[PDB]
Structure formats: structure tokens, C-alpha cells
Write a protein that binds this ligand. Structure first.
Ligand SMILES: CC(C)(CO)NC(=O)c1cccc(Cl)c1
Ligand SMILES: CC(C)(CO)NC(=O)c1cccc(Cl)c1
Ligand SMILES: CC(C)(CO)NC(=O)c1cccc(Cl)c1
Ligand SMILES: CC(C)(CO)NC(=O)c1cccc(Cl)c1
Ligand SMILES: CC(C)(CO)NC(=O)c1cccc(Cl)c1
Lengths: 348, 348, 348, 348, 348
């Protein structure tokens, strides 16, 4: 017996929707849900979505609170909808998918993913929930995540990290590295070889390799010497050039992190969403060097070094396609006299 | 188990809240409540109140659908709150009272009128509901309506008309004339002898006496002759003077109705609420005669004639207090040489 | 090159979207679209929909301005979406369907109805537009309307009336009676034999037969005598019983229209949408007789007389199913000693 | 000492702003202003403007309540702002001008029209207010209205009618016909000779000449015979042609009024504002004949007959410019073999 | 061809408006602009302005992204409007000026600053844009900024810092120190001798002189001794007195910065805007010492020492006017027995 007052009761008493019985008094004013606590209104939820306030409230309350794949991965894999859960997009403060299956009466297109409406949609299945590996097996389109092996099916080892309540982390007390499976029109797909983005923050950046430790601790010309990166434009691409009005390069999160410790800078996230490649309007506070669209990718420095060293440097300009987070990311490679001039995630 | 979805189920299936079990999907957007009917949103309620949308929706759904006293009467009797019902104010599109008793968890100050919080409030009791005459006897303050006698209680015969779902009518298939009782500080108060306003509309005005039929059919000078009203300023007070820029008199609804048939006019209801005396910014469309505050009362013409003929016409100006709808309405009487010049519901 | 300013230019200069080039300055504030006309804002549209303001504005501007089937018919036929047009629902002030095909970038699920997303949806096709009869033949699900014969397709003759810009009318300068066709799962479905509702208003009701003229002019007992309706409970069903607190019968629009001329009454349309059977919370102003859910159908009196006279009157209570507006409407027939007691569109 | 609570006090006690001292409690919620009346909120104003709610409330309260020129006239004369008053536009429910002079602290550009900011603006002056004729003489740009002669200034006799609180009327108890004066760049401009629109409604249309009485009473062919209008296309232009899907002609309000009595029709006012020529999306309910943009002008039939009979009928198509309400209205005249085919207010 | 969808396309693809062709689907809900990115809504802009949402969105997209003068400077110089650009006020999240010239159709008063409407307004001209030094030369009122010299015109050297996308900085890769020119009624003004505020933050405070380094590193009595500031009330004015309930002095940002490293404190910015002098409701967390209006100015400590040492200390209380950021800032100087008691930016 689903209700606004019951969803609110669960939020107040259980921290989220937990199927518990009970009702608390609720008031809705504009885009905010309130509850009366000893005669005064306490805010429970502020609707930042394009859905009706009470509908967004129920989907947020019914969000998956287990470590789940990051929305960028699900998007890159073509996920349209989730099976009997809500993947909450914490970067957008909104549900990751428009419709639901067996979650909310206003957004449900079906109660079970076996309904014919779900057949053409890529449904997300969670092998950690009972019977979901079998629902994937019976589904025409879908993406499956598991913690262990699946009989017959060959896995694609996903990223080490997952999102737990909006916190991207590599689990120690929980499993965050999943096996990924995908089916298009009833056929189990062979997922491609892929690099993964590291999903780190600019403020809390931690190196994940000896090369990353050396980049953060060494001086620019010491690191380029140690790692034989002469002629690969790391000075421009990774370190950044703040000498002209237009900020040069600075496309790797580790380079932004190194800079951030010394001089702060403004990053305007003009398209706020989870994506493999992020675009920022950057303004360097120390120099006044700036760039309207500065594409940034967080690759492990070793993976970026491997990608750039595996390219033909004899062309003036070409598109270099790299598989990252299961999607095809186009890069722009510009060379001159056999040396790199620039390499950046292609702005389109 | 009260919920928004259950209140909505009742509205859709029963025309109002009827305590039936069930839920329909609801969406709230801004100040409107919608329900999904075959994949599309259908508006159920638009909040015109100062309460939260979902709260106003539940109080409107829980409105008393039996003939009830008109809000002006309840206001004139000092009613603060109703016992276990909602008097919906259709003139304001809002609950007639701020708080409720045993109706809605958001607006309830008490579940029963016997709670000590209700003691200082004048609670409205409906003798047609079981145990409500007893609750009135136990109440410190209150107004009671009944269809018959209550042993020991001296009754006040109320108006012939009552409001049934916003329609003011004199019942033929239902009883609309009630006995009224009031209590202030544990003590039954004797309600005063009173005139009652007729609660008629300008558009559908119907005479309720031979004098009212004669006013609408006869010419000004022959009605004044027939009813011996010479020297009582009916030409100014009732008929209206449209010869000057400021509209003269026109304080009785029957006079406005007679005028309306011949020439239309705009009545700006700048304080839209139910009241014994109504104030309008009137603009006569034929002449351009206008008045910012034109007080209008709908008294039966015979009752108005009786009031004006029961006054001493030897003073230049005095306040004449008349009990109408249980409240004391002050009129302003202006005389000259023993004749009336003007008589109007005195602007406070 | 679709834009808000171009949609607004078309509204201002052509009365609706007409594909004309040009832009006018627009301002959006809350749920209203304004345009600057000589330095002042003029309201162009007020959003009464659950869609974003600018989106609802474009769909309203792109509404079909040719006589189209009434939304009740489309709903009864299972229409989910329209092919390259917008059926505007004037009873709801909103699009009749959630999504569009080739209309607006925000609501489009496809540019053409041939896209695989449209296959499971019942798409509405208009044979008056080029290539739409063919698109219906290629559609898995759909409803087709035509002004003439389609080789091979067995037609269903629809109602005489259609909606032209919110005005329901029987065309004289335009064709409003269409041939209807339906397809479910690639298979043409034979539309059932049906009665049609007349789509008349209470305020401007006009009889459409000698029996309807006789009902409105003759007294209750002489009409029942002339048409041999003795023992069919027309006194209760059609005329209405206003003697008790609960209003008895009154389920045919013609009966409400006859009553309306003599005594006015309030009809609360608590589910405001177009439907074959309408539900109203009725309050009779003369008597105070009322009913929370009074189902009303507008059938031609001859069609209602035919339905009631074609029933077996030997059962106490049974469901009588009648096909009206292509949908199966269940009625409740209550008899006693071979005579009708009541017959009403059964409340679901 | 201007305040929201004082503006509200004036509205409640005087029907509008009257400079009286006092305060009432006010609450603002969304776009509505409320006041507490005996413990409950009563709506005083609903903001339909693009200004902040409290600002629109004060300008509406401070509206000119004397008969003023109709907004179409002021617009046609180039009025940008009013001197120390607010012309309320009742067709738009908004102030007729963006800014004020000596009215409201939020919208004031100046306290007096003598301030240099007002010099390039055409300020409206009211000769009925003390010192305003002098302020016009000192103004660089302006429009002046007077009830009599101004020594030296050559007057323009305006329309008989004016707007008194939204009611357009020809005054009997007040003066509504004004003398008009205009100044552009310090120089008095001679206002042109002009026809005036009659400002009548479709619902309450009243003839203002023997020709207008004859048009409404006589049949089409006998009116055209009596007034020698053969070959002037009155059948198309004035009467309207409802035989084809596109409604033919119907550009004079009297023709729409004659039609309205027999058959009703929908007029969609897609640009709701006061203008000399009005544009409507018309749908005829009887025939289904319709037109997206049907320009309508309310000229006295004699004035229209004079205009059409004063044209050379030897050209196929030409623009005929006529001065109406001080503005130049371009008409489109289409002839064939010396007879009129169509004549309509040319769609810009 | 300006549109909402084109402005949105530019924001998404270029980080701001760049005149690029293209359209993205947009939805407006309340005060937020969204765009569809792979079937989900992504927020592009939240309107914090008093302008319509779509209008504020276009002005924000069309903001000047080059280092521009800080809004306080432009305000102090009397700038009313900018020539063909938008100075975005990042302290208010709104345009710095009401109207625009050649930017947006809704806010434009003119397309070119040469139009007569601009003559009485102080237009801001940017010498870095072609032909703007000549538009200033031809303009009646204006402020001009240049990077280099202007023939004939003597410059006023502005502050070292400018705002680049909301980041106030002293440029190293871009020029931020401009030459200022001003014209009032066609006459090139001689701008006054002025001090400049340093525009530093409380958190990221960096000293800009040996005296400022000494203030932050030395103990109160060591610094006052070294700089011979005995008898100048630096203990009260600069350091702050936190011993009583009312916080004493603390009017210089460097003093707040020194305090902030040791003990944190709440600064309530009750008038959030850019101004030479800032007012804060300060509460010291360590002591509970507080002040409702604590005026703070960020002057270079050497400039403040120079101002205070250039005053006559023989009066009890006088207003000391100092030119800071081209405006006249009144200070209050209180002395006793030839020594300073307090000196603060005068609260009016
Ligand atoms: C405080 C400043 C303006 C210093 O330049 N900005 C930041 O510290 C910062 C860091 C990362 C992202 C974003 Cl948006 C701002
Ligand atoms: C349009 C005019 C001004 C014509 O006189 N007014 C009305 O029709 C009218 C009648 C009764 C009440 C209200 Cl408010 C307006
Ligand atoms: C004001 C009253 C209650 C008078 O009977 N009702 C109406 O005039 C009326 C008529 C038809 C429909 C609706 Cl909703 C109301
Ligand atoms: C309901 C219909 C379509 C019936 O013809 N229209 C009107 O009653 C009507 C009359 C005048 C103006 C407007 Cl907008 C509508
Ligand atoms: C966290 C506290 C409450 C500690 O006192 N405040 C701050 O750190 C702080 C600093 C500067 C300005 C503002 Cl508003 C707050």
C-alpha cells in the first residue's frame, strides 16, 4: 500500500525506503517535501529533478543503497532502465533512468522485466539480487553485473570502483569490482577490451601507481626524463601551459591535481553529469590563463602513457579512437617532425 | 491509514473523501494535484489556499457535503474551528477555519474536541452527527446546530437557507433551517433576536414577497406611493442615483438587481469572502457613475422597510445598530427636516 | 531550425505554428509564455499541462487545426500517440498523448512512425495527410481515419461530429464523419457495431430527433404515454427524482437539459477529461437533492429507448454491456415484477 | 511612508490606494497577495504581470480610477509612460507602461516628469490634474488630454468613449470625450483627421446608427439593396462566407455580432491586448468554417461604408491607408471588373 | 537567428555563447534551464536574477569572458550600461546592468551605442574591441578601458587586478591593469587621485608588501613598535577587540585574515554585492564577541597606514573623506588627547 506518507515514514525512520509500515504527516511546498516533527516542519527532500516533487521523492527514497556501477558506465553500455531498483544519479540529483520497473506507480512501465514492454530496452540486472541472473538469461536486451562467475558466460572485468550512496570508492568491506555481461537482441555480446577512468576528485587525489607517485613528487623535467617521455608533449598535455591567455593542454586529472596543490583554479562544470570525458570552463587564478572548453579525463598515468606511446606520430592531425569505460572515445592527435604537439579528448 | 494516494482514490471513485480503501497514482506540480488516467495527467484539484497543496487537497476532499450554515453566520457567531469536519468556504476556495479536529494530521490541533487545546476555541458542533450535542454540552466554547429540540437548551431559529456544496438554497428534499446554540466560557449564551440576509445573487435574483415583486415590476414613484415610503430616501438608498460622478446610495441587493436588468454595471469584489455586508467598487456602464466602496446588504425589502420606518428621523446623524445574521451591523442614518437623506451600512 | 522564438513568431503572426521563418522576443515566467509588443509583455500561453512550459507551448502551437476525432474516441480505440501531429485535448488544456512523432525535439520518441520504437504503440494516422494510409499498412499497431475508401480495408463509419479547434461540430463546410480502421499486432481488427454519444452541452442543448423534441416539449406523463415507455423507469432514469436527499437517477444528458431550463443545478466535474460516460457531483439548487457520483451519458433519446427496450426484464440485477464510442460500457439493470426500477452506466 | 501593508490597508478600506494611513497584515504566496480577516487569508490580488507580485499590487492599487483614454489610443499616440498615475491595462491585467513617474519606488524612473530622464519619453499628461497642462508645455515629448480648451493649443477631438475602471463607456455622469494634444521633440504635432473604433463587445453589441439598426434587422440582400452597396462585396467582407473550409471575410464587428445571434462561434484571441485592429482564430460552430488569422475592426457601419465607397475600384490590388484611432491602418483592396472582391485590414 | 535552443547549443558545445549555429532540446522548469543529454535532463542554468529565466540564461551565456573591471569600479564610475557585451556580476549571480546594447532582444535598448537612447547613459567601452575607443570618442557619456595609450587622452591607471569569469586576479598570462577614461556630457573628465581596494579573500589572503608580511608574522605589540604606530588604535581598528560583547573595530581585511588563522568566525554578508566597503554581521566563534554592522575594507596595509597618519588628530569626531576605487568613501575619525580612538568606514 504505497503512499507519500509511508515513503516519508520510511525516510524519517529508516534513512531510506525499507518497506516498513507507518505514516508521518507530510506537506509539499513548491519543490520541497516537509514533515512535521513536534509541531515544526523539517525538510526531507528538495526536488532538483524534472519529475513531479512527490514522484522524485519516492524514487530518491527507493534508490539502490548498495555499491552500484557509476552512471557513466551504465550510459556507455546503453542501459535504458533498471530491473526493480532505482540508480540514483548523484551528479545530477536525479534518477539515472526516466522509467522504472516494479518501483513507483507513476514511473513504472512494467512490474517485472519479463513484460513485453521491456524486451526492446537494455535492462540493468544485478546478480546480487535473487533471480536476476536468470532474468538476464531470459531477457532480449540487458546488462548484468555479478560478484562471481556465471555458468557458460564469459565475463568482462569492470572497474575496481563503484558508487555507494554517491561515494565512488574501491571497496574493502564490500565488493565494488563486478563482472559485466551484455545482451543485444538475445545474443550475449563480447564486450570490448577497455581502459577505465579512475573517478578521482581534484581535492582528494591519491596516486594509484609508482608513476603517479613520481608525477606528483618530481619536477616536470625530472619525471619526463625518468619515464623517457621526451617528445610526447607532456609539458602541454598533462602539466598545462599557463603562459598565454588561452590555457594550453591540461587534459589529465592528475595534472590538474598537481597544479591545484600549488595554485588554485576555477573549473566551471557547464554540463553537470557523469561522463568518461568531462568538459570544464577553466580559469587559472594565479596567471589568468583560461579555456572555455577544457576536456579532462581521469586515466591512470600509466594507461595514458601507454595510449600516447602506441600511436603513429607521422601524421599532422588524426582522430585516435580509444575504448574507455566500454565506450569509444575519440582523441585528437597533432604531431610535427615525429613529435607530439597535442593529444586531447576530441571536442564535438 | 491516511495518504495522498488514498484521498485521490476517494476523489476519483466517490466524488469526495468517503473512507474507501484504495490508491491511485498522484503527481503534484506547483499548486495542482494530478492523477494518471490511462497514461495522461488529469487535474483533480488546484490549490487556491495559503496551505500546502496536498494539505488543502485533503481538506477539500474531507469537506462537509451536507447542508451547512453559511460561513458568514459561523463567522458572526465566533466559530474558530469545526468538530471532526471541514467547512469548505466556496467564496474563498479555502477551508473556512485554519485548524481541524480529527480530520487531517497536518492541520489537526486535537483528535477529539474534548482535548484541553479546544477549550478556549469556539468549536462548531453538528447535532445531526452522533454524540455532537453531548460534546457541545461538555465544550467550554462552541456553536451547535440541530434539526430539532435539545432538552433544556433554548433554541435560536436560524436562516431558512444553508450551503450545500457551495449552493445556497432553502431545502425541500433536505433540512436547511437549523436551531442555533452558543456557549461562551462554559455558559450558554442567549442568541439575540435577528434579521437574516437572503443570500441571493445579482444574476439570478428572485423576489421573496409581494413588496419585492412590486419593487421589481412597478416604476420608482408608484412603488414609493403604494408602500407609503415618501420621505424615506428610497430613490437614493434603494434605487440609486446615477446622475453624478459619485454613484449615490444603492445599498440593497434588490435595487442593484432592478438596475442590472436595464443597464449592466461592474461590481469589483475587492474583499472576496462571505459577509453580512458586502463592499463593492461599482462602475455603472451606462452613465459612468461610480463608487469605490459601495456597501450592499441583501435584506428582504419588507425587513429593510421595517428597519428604516422604526427610526427616529429628528437627528442630523446617528449610528443605528441592527442585528443581522446574529451580528450587530451599524448603519448611518442622516436626516433633514424630519425626512431621511441617506441610510447605509456604516463603513468601518 | 526549431526554436521557442520561432514558435512564438508563428503564434503571433499565423495564429498557430505554420512553419514560417522569423523570431519574436519571448519571456518565460513561471508557467506563462509572454512576448514583447511595443515595449510591454503580452501573454501568449499559460501552461496547464504537466510538461515544461516551453514544451507545452510548442505542442499547443503545433496542434492539429483540422477537424479531428474527439479524444474520447481515440482513447476508446487505444490510441497511444499521433503520427506527425498533436491532438490537443481542450477538455484538459493539454496534449492528448505524452509523446510525439516528428513534432517536438523534447517529446519525440521518433521522427517517423516507421521507427521500431513505435511498433508496440497504437499510432494514430490521418488519411487526409499524404502517405499516412501507407504508414498505417506498415504499422504494427494503429488507428486510421479517412474521408473515403481504402482498397481492401473494411471501414467503420465513425460519429457524424469531430472536434475542430476544441469546437465539437457536425461539419457542413468540412468533413467530420470519418471511416475508422484499427490494427493490433500487425492484424487489422474489425471494429465493433456501436452507438455514438452525441457530444452536446448542457447550456446549448439541441434535440436531434422528433422523440427528443417531444421529450423537451411534452410533460413527463404524456411523453411516457406517447412513446409507450410505461414500466421503463424513465421518471427515475431520465427525468430524475429530486424528492429525497439523494438525487435519484438522472443519467441521460437530455434529462439534465430539460431540468436545467426550469431549475438550475451544480455539476462538479471531479475528473475533467473527455469520456463516453461522465461523472458529476450534482447538487440541485431548487430542492437540495444531491448525488456524489452521478454518471451521465449523452445518447440520442431514441438510442437509449432502443437499448432499454432490448433488455430482458425478468432478472433482479444484471450487467448489461452496450458498445458506445467503440468501447464496452457496462450498465446496471435492476428490475422488479417485470418492470424496470433503475438502469445506469455502472460505476466502476 | 509607502509600504505593502499600507497599500493593502487602502485596498481593504477604500477599494483602491487613497493615501490613507494604516496597515493590515499581508502575506505573499507565489503570485498572490493575501490579508488576514478574522484569522483567515482573503485574496486581495493575483499577479498576472511580469513584475514582482508586491510591485504589481501597488501599481494596480494606484491605478487611475477616472475615465481615461483606452490603451489602444495611448499606444497609437506613442505613449511610453504616464505622469504621476498608472494607466491600468484591463485587457492584459497589467500596467499599460513599464515604468512610472512619482508612483512606486520600484518602477519610478523619476519623481517628476520635469526630470531629464523623461525628456525623450512620450509622457501622458492629464489636464484634469492641477499643473499637468503646464508640465506638457515644458515636456519635450508628451500626449495631453483635456476636458476644455488650452489657450494657443490646437485641439484634436478624441473618441466619445473612455475606460472607467475597465468599463469602456460614453459618459453621461462623467466626461469621456477629451481634447488630445501631442508633442514630439519639443514641437506640438498636429494630430491627423481620424475615424474612431467604437469599442463594442460581441456579446452586448448595440447599433449606433439607422444603418447599423438596418444591418442587424434586414436580410443580407435587402440591406445591400437599401444602401446601394451592390458590387462592394459586403456578402464576403461584412456578412462572412461560411461555405468553404476557410471562412471568407468577416472583418467588421457588426457582421460578427449579426452572425453570433443566429449561430455561435469561437474567437481565439491569440494576442490578448487592446488594439485598433484585432486578430482572431475563428471557428464557426455551425459549419466548421474557420480562419487562423481573421482581422476584425469595430468601425461604425456608416464609417466603413464611407471608406469603401471612397476607393478607386479600377486596380487589381492595392494598399488603402485609413487613419483610425490616430494610427495609419493599411487595408488590402482587391477588385475585378470595377467591383470589390475583398477589402480587409492588411495582415502585417 | 537568436533562439533559446541556439543559446543552449552554444553553452553545451562551447562553454558559453560563441555565435555557433545549432540547436539542442531545452526544457524550462520554474527558474532552471535543462537540456536533454541521452534521454535525461541535465541542468544548464539556475536563474538567481529578477529577469525571466530564458532572458537571464541568454545574458549569462553572453557574458564577457575576458578580464573585465570589477563591478564595484564600474559602479563607482557611474557605468549604466555596457557597449555590446554583458558584465556578469558573479557576487549577485546576475547581470551588472539592467539593459544591454546589441546583446539580447529582450534587454536591448539599442543595437549600437551611437543611438540617441544611449547619449545620456554612461556607456562602458572596451578599447580591446575594435572601434570602441572611437565610439567612446564620439559618445557623450562613457567610461573607457584600454591596455595601452590613447592619442591626446591622459589615462588614469586602474587597479592591478580584474575579474576573469568571476575570479579576481592580477594577470600574468593576460593584462588586468587598465587605463581608465571617463566622459561626462562630451567632456573628458580628469579622474581623481585614488587608492584601490585589493579585492582579497579571507581564506586565500596573501600579503602584498613587507608591512603586510610583518603584520601577519609579528605579534601585535612587535608590529606596532616596528612601524611606529603607537597612538593610532591599530589594536582596536586593525587587530580587533574581542574582550566585550560588542566586537571592537576589525575594519581591515588583513586583520580579519590574521584572526581567521587562529580562531574562525561567522561573517553574515547581509547585502551581497560588490562594493568598495563591505558590511558584515560578524560573530567571533572563540569569544562570542559580535557586531551587527562591521564595515570592512581591503586596503593595502601601507595605504591604510598612510591615510590614518595623514589626519589631524586634534578633533573629537569628524568625517574623513578618502578617494578609494574612484569613489568618495567617508570614514569616521574619533580622537582623544591627540591619539586615535577609532577610525572606521562610516556606516550610513
Ligand atoms: C576558490 C577558487 C575561485 C580559487 O581559484 N576556486 C576553487 O578553489 C575551485 C576548485 C575546483 C573547482 C572549482 Cl569550481 C573551484
Ligand atoms: C462588463 C461590464 C462592465 C458591463 O457592465 N460588467 C458586467 O457584465 C458585470 C456584471 C456583474 C458583475 C460584474 Cl463583476 C460584472
Ligand atoms: C450556481 C449554481 C449552483 C446555480 O444552480 N450552478 C450553476 O449555475 C451551474 C450550471 C451548470 C453547471 C455548473 Cl458547474 C454550475
Ligand atoms: C463554445 C463555442 C465554440 C460555441 O460556439 N464558442 C463560444 O461560445 C464563444 C463565443 C464567443 C467567444 C468565444 Cl472565445 C467563444
Ligand atoms: C564555520 C564557522 C561557523 C566558524 O566560525 N564559520 C566560518 O568558517 C566562516 C568564515 C568566513 C565567512 C563565513 Cl560566513 C563563515
Amino acid at each position: 500500500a504505497m503512499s507519500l506518507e509511508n515513503v516519508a515514514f520510511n525516510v524519517v525512520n529508516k534513512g531510506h525506503f525499507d518497506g516498513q509500515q507507518g505514516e508521518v504527516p507530510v506537506s509539499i511546498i513548491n519543490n520541497t517535501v516537509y514533515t512535521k516533527v513536534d509541531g515544526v516542519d523539517v525538510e526531507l527532500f528538495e526536488n532538483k529533478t524534472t519529475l513531479p516533487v512527490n514522484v522524485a521523492f519516492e524514487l530518491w527514497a527507493k534508490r539502490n543503497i548498495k555499491p552500484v556501477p557509476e552512471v557513466k558506465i551504465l550510459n556507455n553500455l546503453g542501459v535504458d532502465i533498471a530491473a526493480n531498483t532505482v540508480i540514483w544519479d548523484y551528479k545530477r540529483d536525479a534518477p539515472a533512468h526516466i522509467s522504472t520497473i516494479g518501483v513507483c506507480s507513476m514511473t513504472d512501465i512494467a512490474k517485472k522485466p519479463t513484460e513485453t514492454i521491456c524486451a526492446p530496452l537494455t535492462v540493468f540486472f544485478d546478480g546480487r539480487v535473487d533471480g536476476q541472473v536468470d532474468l538476464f538469461r531470459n531477457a532480449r536486451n540487458g546488462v548484468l553485473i555479478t560478484e562471481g562467475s556465471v555458468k557458460g558466460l564469459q565475463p568482462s572485468v569492470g572497474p575496481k570502483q563503484a558508487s555507494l550512496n554517491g561515494v565512488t570508492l574501491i571497496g574493502e568491506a564490500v565488493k565494488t569490482q563486478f563482472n559485466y555481461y551484455k545482451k543485444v537482441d538475445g545474443v550475449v555480446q563480447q564486450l570490448p577490451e577497455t581502459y577505465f577512468t579512475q573517478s578521482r576528485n581534484l581535492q582528494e587525489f591519491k596516486p594509484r601507481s609508482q608513476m603517479e607517485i613520481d608525477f606528483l613528487e618530481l619536477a616536470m623535467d625530472e619525471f619526463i626524463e625518468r619515464y623517457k617521455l621526451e617528445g610526447y608533449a607532456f609539458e602541454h598535455i598533462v602539466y598545462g601551459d599557463f603562459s598565454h591567455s588561452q590555457l594550453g593542454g591540461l587534459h589529465l586529472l592528475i595534472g590538474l591535481a598537481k597544479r591545484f596543490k600549488e595554485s588554485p583554479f576555477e573549473l566551471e562544470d557547464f554540463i553537470p553529469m557523469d561522463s568518461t570525458v568531462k568538459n570544464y570552463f577553466i580559469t587559472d587564478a594565479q596567471t589568468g590563463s583560461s579555456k572555455c572548453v577544457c576536456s579532462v579525463i581521469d586515466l591512470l598515468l600509466d594507461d595514458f602513457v601507454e595510449i600516447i606511446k602506441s600511436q603513429d606520430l607521422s601524421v599532422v592531425s588524426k582522430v585516435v579512437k580509444v575504448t574507455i569505460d566500454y565506450t569509444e572515445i575519440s582523441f585528437m592527435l597533432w604531431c610535427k617532425d615525429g613529435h607530439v604537439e597535442t593529444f586531447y579528448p576530441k571536442l564535438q
